[PDB]
Amino acid sequence: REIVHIQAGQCGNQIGAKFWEVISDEHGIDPTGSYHGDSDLQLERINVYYNEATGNKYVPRAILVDLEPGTMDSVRSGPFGQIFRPDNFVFGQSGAGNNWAKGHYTEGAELVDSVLDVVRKESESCDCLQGFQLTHSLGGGTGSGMGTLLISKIREEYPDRIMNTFSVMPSPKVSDTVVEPYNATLSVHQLVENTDETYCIDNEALYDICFRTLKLTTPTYGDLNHLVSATMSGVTTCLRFPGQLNADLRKLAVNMVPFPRLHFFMPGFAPLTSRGQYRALTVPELTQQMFDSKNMMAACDPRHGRYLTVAAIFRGRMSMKEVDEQMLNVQNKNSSYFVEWIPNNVKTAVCDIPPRGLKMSATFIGNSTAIQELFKRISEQFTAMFRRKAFLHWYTGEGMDEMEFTEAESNMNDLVSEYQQYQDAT
Amino acid sequence: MYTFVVRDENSSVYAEVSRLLLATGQWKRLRKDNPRFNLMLGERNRLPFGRLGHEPGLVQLVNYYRGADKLCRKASLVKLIKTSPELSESCTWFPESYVIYPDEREVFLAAYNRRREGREGNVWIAKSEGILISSEASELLDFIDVHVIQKYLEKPLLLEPGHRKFDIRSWVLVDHLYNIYLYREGVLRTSSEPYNSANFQDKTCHLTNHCIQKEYSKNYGRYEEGNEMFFEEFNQYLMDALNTTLENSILLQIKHIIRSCLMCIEPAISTKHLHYQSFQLFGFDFMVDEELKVWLIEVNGAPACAQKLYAELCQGIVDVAISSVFPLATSIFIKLHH
Amino acid sequence: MEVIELNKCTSGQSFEVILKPPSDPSLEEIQKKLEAAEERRKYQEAELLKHLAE
Amino acid sequence: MRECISIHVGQAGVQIGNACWELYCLEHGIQPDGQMPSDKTIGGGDDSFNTFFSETGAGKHVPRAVFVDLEPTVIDEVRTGTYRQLFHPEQLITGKEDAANNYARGHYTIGKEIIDLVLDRIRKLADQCTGLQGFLVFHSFGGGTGSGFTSLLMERLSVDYGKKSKLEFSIYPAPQVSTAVVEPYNSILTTHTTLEHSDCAFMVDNEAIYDICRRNLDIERPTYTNLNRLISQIVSSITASLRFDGALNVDLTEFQTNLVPYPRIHFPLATYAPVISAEKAYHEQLSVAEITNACFEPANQMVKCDPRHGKYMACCLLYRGDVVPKDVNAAIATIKTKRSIQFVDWCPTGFKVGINYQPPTVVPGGDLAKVQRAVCMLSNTTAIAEAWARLDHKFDLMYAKRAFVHWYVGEGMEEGEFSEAREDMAALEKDYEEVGVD
Ligand SMILES: Nc1nc2c(ncn2[C@@H]2O[C@H](COP(=O)(O)OP(=O)(O)OP(=O)(O)O)[C@@H](O)[C@H]2O)c(=O)[nH]1
Ligand SMILES: Nc1ncnc2c1ncn2[C@@H]1O[C@H](COP(=O)(O)OP(=O)(O)CP(=O)(O)O)[C@@H](O)[C@H]1O
Ligand SMILES: Nc1nc2c(ncn2[C@@H]2O[C@H](COP(=O)(O)OP(=O)(O)O)[C@@H](O)[C@H]2O)c(=O)[nH]1
Ligand SMILES: CCCCc1ccc2[nH]c(NC(=O)OC)nc2c1
Ligand SMILES: [Ca+2]
Ligand SMILES: [Mg+2]
Ligand SMILES: [Mg+2]
Ligand SMILES: [Mg+2]
């Protein structure tokens, strides 16, 4: 049943907030916390993400974490800001300075037990907790360094629960500081070890989509988060509405993850829409677009690797016979990019209720070995600075040693070799 | 755009069929064990028929009929003929044959001696390259120690000039609808050595296999290129020499035999209402005797074509067997009707 | 083709037609293996928890 | 009279369980509340339907059935559906959190904590039995509970009820109606550990049922409801001899002696005819010969395979409706002349026939039309080994890379159980090949 949600840092809290906006509208919950919808299908799985509270209002099972109060005060001021449980706002005062070491070892360590007390209070009210989801970026300090510290501590206290992350990957096209490859590389090893699923949301891809495809000349973070909230809605449609499958987080992970470390997914969405069209997509169009590189939120070419597993979730009123034929069409048409040793590795679900503003949509979840391109990219940016020990003083000043960077870089290259082993297999 | 797999690399025929399919631009070749194929050109041995037709959304076709080996191996062909009422024990066009293991051995020798005390020829052949002919029963029964023993045809039709022996190979395609298609161009595999009724263990005169003649025989390629005479020359000979045609004297019998062999096993092998579908190309071998009577020798399940006819036959396998199932963007076959 | 052993009642009949004649582990072993798997599972978790302690 | 206990395990077992008990009620005139006006022996009975129903002093007819799932959603729809009253609350057992399509989780981790509870709710039904025959066990191959917990249950039932018979109805996995990918693992694992504990198992490939639903019922995309109502028709025709007056397959032991001479080869093929759409405006009713002939068409089998390329060890025809022996024998004679029916040498070539005069009951508002006569053929043919060949091949492809194996090792299974299970299946495939090909 219950999922506990955590959002850490600026990026984590900004996309986390938009996620709760979007799905709160899908379940008919208003900023009050009052259900004001029309179909009881909106309420049948409301408990996955919401607690029922005083006055029979619905309160997100959400914990909001930052090392500075800025972004969280602006969440409390945001549209749905009053919907969150005030006790679940856990913030420090000093910030993390885009510094993984401050988030993971010094400032964050000061705050982390406080966050786990809230997690514990939310789990204890859970009839049968499926697991956790985290929104965060890997490029800064709090979401990256404290987020992964949190994930380690959660794994210590709940080692038999699923941990899934929506992890924003840094890119020089959308870049706050030069030390993002450092923070991302340190974080990716934490994720390899302590996560069951990670959605690699590449800020490169989000930018390119807004620019090349939504024709947005100068995309903002709001442009980028619109894509992310639409994709998170689609990825979790499975769990929030009654459909064909009844799969919890564990069962979804079981059928997507053939090898424990290869759990980094490329998400995609169709149709791609900017903040502000009336011609619905045909089922052949949904299907073609969701497999198109340009609809992928992880800036990797799927034709440069092989799909280990794919899931897809179609939303709206449509012909599942036509879905079946189109899904089977795009596989049997391109069976060269699916591994041959996982039979029937493309799975599809339909949900009748479409997202706000579309009559038809499709969410793509690919476990492709092409994701190695993302990790190679971060690794090249990492070593370009690291071979001159550039900007390291920010980290050694918090107690870290160069050796910990050498290990993180080397773990990342191992992960890349693993993906390459299966891209050439049978 | 259709997909296919190639699981028999050493088939002359489907090697060419694979290359014709690609050149249409609407066929893509996958690797051996990819199961998302439309068409399988399968191995000759242990082909996995049980795995076909279980891929959702894929029409699947294979170039072999499961069960057709009963027609296409020596011992099972004899058992199929003698025990199937459609091809009686009284079957006018199959040589009297016997299944002997290293069973009908005692049944056979009753046939020997009624002919032997009946003042008739008693030359027999043993078959299963390990092939021996003689009028001694002791001879081959000795030598066998499964094999088949059948009456040698002591008066074959002999072409002149040469006084030479021959056999006819006919190519037959059975499509997924069990239409029986006889390829219009047959071939006649001749011996270049003349024929001699006394020295049976001079077998390069008595066995017309293309292999024997090429480097075990003295006068190969003498009379015709390849020891291969096509149908137009053989027809002219029968007109010039015997005052008849290939159609009347021989082909009528050949068509009757092909249709009766294939119509007999149809209920056992047909894929009409199966979840996958088969076609298959057969090679039928006939002996013609001096009375212009045709005899079936053996059926080949994986045959090679004659070099001049590959282009035309393989193009006809694509048209009638493959694109009949998977359509794209006068005929060289005679349809044998049932 | 001989019809054999015909039996009739008010709800139906049965018979045979012939066309041709012819030519464990203990309770303790189970609970042993259910407890071996549980200690393999408790060992792998202790390895993780020690790893998390380093 | 001897009683039979039905055990439904996992989602697939539970939902098929419901489809059958619904049908059983419609056939025996039992109402949703559990009352049967035609039963004049109130509060008890030696009757044939009492092999499946107990009676309460209040005249209520109660299935000898236990439902078990490791997660509550599906059994909660039993608890609240049309047949709430039918079932004793103690017969519906749910866990908290399911096996996640993981055999190991269903067998070892979650199964160990609930096995004793299930065995105790089974023992309470067995204690109301004057002479218990044994068990009918419904489950999927592909599910974590259906595979993992079932095999553990089967092991314990053999120690606790050693001389009782156990029959399975097993749903074999079809990609068309499954979102899992590790189902080949679960199927091989549950088959290996259940083989020596099952006397007779009726496999149903969801692929075959799906296509029957599409071709013959004109359902464009069958649901589980479509699949299960058709499945329960087949199961009902298979168990009718346990619940009605007659002389064929009258106890569980007879299933084995009539259908399983060699005990490892205990997987009879079911073929069912006719399946006719209830929305077919004009239907010409099929004769005895047409429906019996249809028992030899692969398109009507529960597992798509080709019996012409195998050998039979037994064959049973179960007719419901307007059928008499003379028309059966006339159909059989014409069918042997036109079909490839080859028995093994050590078995007679012949057919055990059972006729029940009551035609098939259909669920009101289902997809199946009423028909004047139907037949279910049970034949033990080696051709069903094709389904083991398919599954084993899928297992080999994944296991060569150890794909997904870590999920099982992490629940306490050892890697070597995978290869021990796979080699049992290799033995099984060769047993079939010995028996069935020359
Ligand atoms: N025919 C039929 N098959 C079903 C049904 N429900 C599930 N299945 C099939 O069974 C397999 C999935 O196993 P389930 O029975 O759902 O799983 P389970 O036994 O509940 O085990 P877990 O949910 O993993 O704990 C898939 O092949 C499904 O297609 C059903 O109602 N009818
Ligand atoms: N009963 C018989 N009487 C006379 N000649 C016979 C005969 N049986 C066989 N032959 C001769 O023996 C030759 C080879 O016989 P057989 O057909 O057994 O070989 P084979 O299997 O290699 C032909 P293929 O390459 O078409 O399969 C034939 O070409 C024919 O000349
Ligand atoms: N997509 C997206 N990326 C963001 C957002 N905010 C920050 N980022 C990225 O996150 C990284 C900086 O992390 P940030 O969340 O600001 O640091 P933190 O608050 O210390 O965790 C950089 O890669 C930024 O490009 C956002 O709202 N959306
Ligand atoms: C049959 C198609 C299956 C679709 C599918 C598959 C795997 C998933 N994993 C998650 N995880 C998540 O939503 O975390 C909050 N959702 C999923 C949805
Ligand atoms: Ca009674
Ligand atoms: Mg920032
Ligand atoms: Mg030969
Ligand atoms: Mg289940």
Side-chain angles (χ1 to χ4, degrees), chain A residues 67-92:
Chain A
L67 276 174
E68 66 202 347
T71 300
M72 290 191 12
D73 272 278
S74 100
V75 152
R76 223 185 272 104
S77 284
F80 277 75
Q82 313 275 81
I83 207 189
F84 298 105
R85 176 183 233 287
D87 273 358
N88 287 21
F89 288 78
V90 189
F91 52 101

mmCIF file of all heavy atoms in Angstrom, chain A residues 67-92:
data_model
loop_
_atom_site.group_PDB
_atom_site.id
_atom_site.type_symbol
_atom_site.label_atom_id
_atom_site.label_comp_id
_atom_site.label_asym_id
_atom_site.label_seq_id
_atom_site.Cartn_x
_atom_site.Cartn_y
_atom_site.Cartn_z
ATOM 1 N N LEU A 67 18.756 22.014 3.670
ATOM 2 C CA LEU A 67 19.725 22.597 4.580
ATOM 3 C C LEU A 67 19.594 24.120 4.697
ATOM 4 O O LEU A 67 20.190 24.712 5.607
ATOM 5 C CB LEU A 67 21.133 22.210 4.136
ATOM 6 C CG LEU A 67 21.483 20.837 4.684
ATOM 7 C CD1 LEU A 67 22.830 20.300 4.167
ATOM 8 C CD2 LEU A 67 21.420 20.881 6.206
ATOM 9 N N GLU A 68 18.856 24.768 3.805
ATOM 10 C CA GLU A 68 18.528 26.178 3.928
ATOM 11 C C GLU A 68 17.023 26.324 3.820
ATOM 12 O O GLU A 68 16.355 25.470 3.232
ATOM 13 C CB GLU A 68 19.225 27.032 2.858
ATOM 14 C CG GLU A 68 18.800 26.790 1.414
ATOM 15 C CD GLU A 68 19.896 27.251 0.442
ATOM 16 O OE1 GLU A 68 20.835 27.957 0.904
ATOM 17 O OE2 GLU A 68 19.833 26.906 -0.770
ATOM 18 N N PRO A 69 16.451 27.384 4.396
ATOM 19 C CA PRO A 69 14.981 27.499 4.422
ATOM 20 C C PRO A 69 14.372 28.082 3.160
ATOM 21 O O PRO A 69 13.156 27.939 2.968
ATOM 22 C CB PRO A 69 14.714 28.416 5.627
ATOM 23 C CG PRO A 69 16.079 28.671 6.271
ATOM 24 C CD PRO A 69 17.107 28.400 5.232
ATOM 25 N N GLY A 70 15.165 28.718 2.301
ATOM 26 C CA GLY A 70 14.667 29.369 1.101
ATOM 27 C C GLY A 70 13.605 28.619 0.316
ATOM 28 O O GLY A 70 12.424 28.995 0.361
ATOM 29 N N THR A 71 14.005 27.549 -0.387
ATOM 30 C CA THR A 71 13.075 26.831 -1.265
ATOM 31 C C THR A 71 11.879 26.264 -0.497
ATOM 32 O O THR A 71 10.788 26.124 -1.065
ATOM 33 C CB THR A 71 13.805 25.703 -2.026
ATOM 34 O OG1 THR A 71 14.865 26.251 -2.828
ATOM 35 C CG2 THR A 71 12.843 24.932 -2.955
ATOM 36 N N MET A 72 12.041 25.955 0.793
ATOM 37 C CA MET A 72 10.915 25.359 1.505
ATOM 38 C C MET A 72 9.901 26.403 1.943
ATOM 39 O O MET A 72 8.694 26.145 1.917
ATOM 40 C CB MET A 72 11.412 24.546 2.689
ATOM 41 C CG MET A 72 12.125 23.286 2.231
ATOM 42 S SD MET A 72 12.473 22.135 3.561
ATOM 43 C CE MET A 72 11.484 22.778 4.920
ATOM 44 N N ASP A 73 10.359 27.587 2.335
ATOM 45 C CA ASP A 73 9.412 28.671 2.549
ATOM 46 C C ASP A 73 8.653 29.005 1.271
ATOM 47 O O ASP A 73 7.463 29.339 1.324
ATOM 48 C CB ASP A 73 10.140 29.895 3.090
ATOM 49 C CG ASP A 73 10.230 29.877 4.595
ATOM 50 O OD1 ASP A 73 9.241 30.275 5.260
ATOM 51 O OD2 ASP A 73 11.276 29.429 5.109
ATOM 52 N N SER A 74 9.308 28.905 0.115
ATOM 53 C CA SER A 74 8.590 29.139 -1.126
ATOM 54 C C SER A 74 7.722 27.946 -1.532
ATOM 55 O O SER A 74 6.795 28.119 -2.329
ATOM 56 C CB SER A 74 9.566 29.525 -2.243
ATOM 57 O OG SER A 74 9.860 28.424 -3.078
ATOM 58 N N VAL A 75 7.960 26.751 -0.988
ATOM 59 C CA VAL A 75 6.977 25.686 -1.164
ATOM 60 C C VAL A 75 5.746 25.962 -0.309
ATOM 61 O O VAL A 75 4.616 25.951 -0.809
ATOM 62 C CB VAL A 75 7.590 24.307 -0.862
ATOM 63 C CG1 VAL A 75 6.519 23.347 -0.369
ATOM 64 C CG2 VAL A 75 8.232 23.749 -2.115
ATOM 65 N N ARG A 76 5.947 26.247 0.984
ATOM 66 C CA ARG A 76 4.825 26.575 1.861
ATOM 67 C C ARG A 76 3.989 27.723 1.308
ATOM 68 O O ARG A 76 2.774 27.779 1.540
ATOM 69 C CB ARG A 76 5.337 26.926 3.257
ATOM 70 C CG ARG A 76 4.520 26.327 4.398
ATOM 71 C CD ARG A 76 5.041 26.835 5.733
ATOM 72 N NE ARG A 76 6.128 26.019 6.292
ATOM 73 C CZ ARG A 76 7.423 26.352 6.280
ATOM 74 N NH1 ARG A 76 7.827 27.491 5.723
ATOM 75 N NH2 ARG A 76 8.324 25.549 6.836
ATOM 76 N N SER A 77 4.621 28.636 0.567
ATOM 77 C CA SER A 77 3.930 29.728 -0.103
ATOM 78 C C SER A 77 3.372 29.335 -1.463
ATOM 79 O O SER A 77 2.593 30.098 -2.036
ATOM 80 C CB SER A 77 4.883 30.923 -0.264
ATOM 81 O OG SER A 77 5.044 31.601 0.977
ATOM 82 N N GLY A 78 3.762 28.177 -2.002
ATOM 83 C CA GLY A 78 3.357 27.787 -3.322
ATOM 84 C C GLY A 78 1.885 27.412 -3.387
ATOM 85 O O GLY A 78 1.154 27.469 -2.389
ATOM 86 N N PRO A 79 1.436 27.014 -4.593
ATOM 87 C CA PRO A 79 0.007 26.705 -4.800
ATOM 88 C C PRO A 79 -0.555 25.717 -3.786
ATOM 89 O O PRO A 79 -1.487 26.037 -3.031
ATOM 90 C CB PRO A 79 -0.031 26.119 -6.223
ATOM 91 C CG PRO A 79 1.264 26.568 -6.884
ATOM 92 C CD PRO A 79 2.264 26.754 -5.790
ATOM 93 N N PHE A 80 0.014 24.511 -3.758
ATOM 94 C CA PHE A 80 -0.452 23.463 -2.865
ATOM 95 C C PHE A 80 0.327 23.437 -1.556
ATOM 96 O O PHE A 80 0.304 22.418 -0.851
ATOM 97 C CB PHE A 80 -0.388 22.101 -3.566
ATOM 98 C CG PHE A 80 -1.582 21.807 -4.445
ATOM 99 C CD1 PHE A 80 -1.729 22.432 -5.673
ATOM 100 C CD2 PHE A 80 -2.558 20.901 -4.044
ATOM 101 C CE1 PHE A 80 -2.826 22.162 -6.494
ATOM 102 C CE2 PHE A 80 -3.668 20.627 -4.851
ATOM 103 C CZ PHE A 80 -3.799 21.256 -6.081
ATOM 104 N N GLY A 81 0.987 24.551 -1.207
ATOM 105 C CA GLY A 81 1.918 24.543 -0.089
ATOM 106 C C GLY A 81 1.284 24.199 1.243
ATOM 107 O O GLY A 81 1.949 23.646 2.126
ATOM 108 N N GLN A 82 0.000 24.522 1.416
ATOM 109 C CA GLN A 82 -0.671 24.246 2.678
ATOM 110 C C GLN A 82 -1.070 22.787 2.825
ATOM 111 O O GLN A 82 -1.427 22.374 3.933
ATOM 112 C CB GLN A 82 -1.906 25.140 2.834
ATOM 113 C CG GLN A 82 -1.656 26.620 2.518
ATOM 114 C CD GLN A 82 -1.094 27.415 3.704
ATOM 115 O OE1 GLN A 82 0.114 27.379 3.985
ATOM 116 N NE2 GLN A 82 -1.973 28.148 4.395
ATOM 117 N N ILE A 83 -0.996 22.000 1.745
ATOM 118 C CA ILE A 83 -1.454 20.614 1.778
ATOM 119 C C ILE A 83 -0.533 19.748 2.629
ATOM 120 O O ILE A 83 -0.967 18.730 3.171
ATOM 121 C CB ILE A 83 -1.576 20.070 0.340
ATOM 122 C CG1 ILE A 83 -2.622 18.971 0.246
ATOM 123 C CG2 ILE A 83 -0.251 19.489 -0.161
ATOM 124 C CD1 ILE A 83 -2.598 18.294 -1.111
ATOM 125 N N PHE A 84 0.734 20.133 2.776
ATOM 126 C CA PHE A 84 1.718 19.302 3.460
ATOM 127 C C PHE A 84 1.596 19.426 4.974
ATOM 128 O O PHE A 84 1.239 20.485 5.508
ATOM 129 C CB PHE A 84 3.133 19.686 3.026
ATOM 130 C CG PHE A 84 3.376 19.488 1.569
ATOM 131 C CD1 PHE A 84 3.424 20.574 0.712
ATOM 132 C CD2 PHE A 84 3.529 18.198 1.045
ATOM 133 C CE1 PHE A 84 3.630 20.389 -0.642
ATOM 134 C CE2 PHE A 84 3.730 18.005 -0.314
ATOM 135 C CZ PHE A 84 3.778 19.100 -1.160
ATOM 136 N N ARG A 85 1.916 18.330 5.658
ATOM 137 C CA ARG A 85 1.929 18.285 7.118
ATOM 138 C C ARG A 85 3.037 19.187 7.664
ATOM 139 O O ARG A 85 4.225 18.937 7.390
ATOM 140 C CB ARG A 85 2.117 16.837 7.572
ATOM 141 C CG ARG A 85 2.255 16.633 9.070
ATOM 142 C CD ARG A 85 2.506 15.149 9.395
ATOM 143 N NE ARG A 85 1.568 14.618 10.390
ATOM 144 C CZ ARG A 85 1.602 14.911 11.695
ATOM 145 N NH1 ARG A 85 2.524 15.738 12.183
ATOM 146 N NH2 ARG A 85 0.706 14.381 12.519
ATOM 147 N N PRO A 86 2.706 20.241 8.422
ATOM 148 C CA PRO A 86 3.747 21.200 8.840
ATOM 149 C C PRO A 86 4.890 20.559 9.602
ATOM 150 O O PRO A 86 6.047 20.976 9.442
ATOM 151 C CB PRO A 86 2.965 22.194 9.711
ATOM 152 C CG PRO A 86 1.557 22.082 9.200
ATOM 153 C CD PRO A 86 1.369 20.634 8.898
ATOM 154 N N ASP A 87 4.601 19.532 10.405
ATOM 155 C CA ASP A 87 5.645 18.793 11.105
ATOM 156 C C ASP A 87 6.680 18.189 10.151
ATOM 157 O O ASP A 87 7.819 17.925 10.560
ATOM 158 C CB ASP A 87 5.010 17.676 11.930
ATOM 159 C CG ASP A 87 4.595 18.125 13.313
ATOM 160 O OD1 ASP A 87 4.826 19.306 13.668
ATOM 161 O OD2 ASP A 87 4.030 17.279 14.046
ATOM 162 N N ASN A 88 6.308 17.937 8.893
ATOM 163 C CA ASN A 88 7.170 17.222 7.955
ATOM 164 C C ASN A 88 8.112 18.145 7.182
ATOM 165 O O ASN A 88 8.743 17.700 6.213
ATOM 166 C CB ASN A 88 6.314 16.400 6.984
ATOM 167 C CG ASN A 88 5.697 15.172 7.644
ATOM 168 O OD1 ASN A 88 5.570 15.101 8.868
ATOM 169 N ND2 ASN A 88 5.331 14.188 6.828
ATOM 170 N N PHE A 89 8.191 19.421 7.564
ATOM 171 C CA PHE A 89 9.166 20.356 7.011
ATOM 172 C C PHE A 89 10.390 20.327 7.922
ATOM 173 O O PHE A 89 10.315 20.769 9.076
ATOM 174 C CB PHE A 89 8.593 21.766 6.939
ATOM 175 C CG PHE A 89 7.538 21.970 5.886
ATOM 176 C CD1 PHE A 89 6.228 21.535 6.090
ATOM 177 C CD2 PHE A 89 7.842 22.655 4.708
ATOM 178 C CE1 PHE A 89 5.247 21.754 5.133
ATOM 179 C CE2 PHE A 89 6.862 22.873 3.744
ATOM 180 C CZ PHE A 89 5.559 22.426 3.968
ATOM 181 N N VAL A 90 11.508 19.796 7.419
ATOM 182 C CA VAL A 90 12.729 19.618 8.204
ATOM 183 C C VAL A 90 13.860 20.353 7.489
ATOM 184 O O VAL A 90 14.320 19.921 6.419
ATOM 185 C CB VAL A 90 13.080 18.139 8.413
ATOM 186 C CG1 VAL A 90 14.224 18.021 9.404
ATOM 187 C CG2 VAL A 90 11.897 17.374 8.919
ATOM 188 N N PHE A 91 14.311 21.461 8.080
ATOM 189 C CA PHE A 91 15.300 22.319 7.442
ATOM 190 C C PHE A 91 16.371 22.764 8.427
ATOM 191 O O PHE A 91 16.094 22.958 9.612
ATOM 192 C CB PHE A 91 14.645 23.544 6.792
ATOM 193 C CG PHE A 91 13.735 24.321 7.700
ATOM 194 C CD1 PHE A 91 14.176 25.501 8.299
ATOM 195 C CD2 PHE A 91 12.431 23.900 7.929
ATOM 196 C CE1 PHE A 91 13.336 26.226 9.124
ATOM 197 C CE2 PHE A 91 11.582 24.620 8.751
ATOM 198 C CZ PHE A 91 12.033 25.787 9.350
ATOM 199 N N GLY A 92 17.606 22.878 7.928
ATOM 200 C CA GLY A 92 18.668 23.572 8.623
ATOM 201 C C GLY A 92 18.742 25.019 8.172
ATOM 202 O O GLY A 92 17.911 25.502 7.402
#
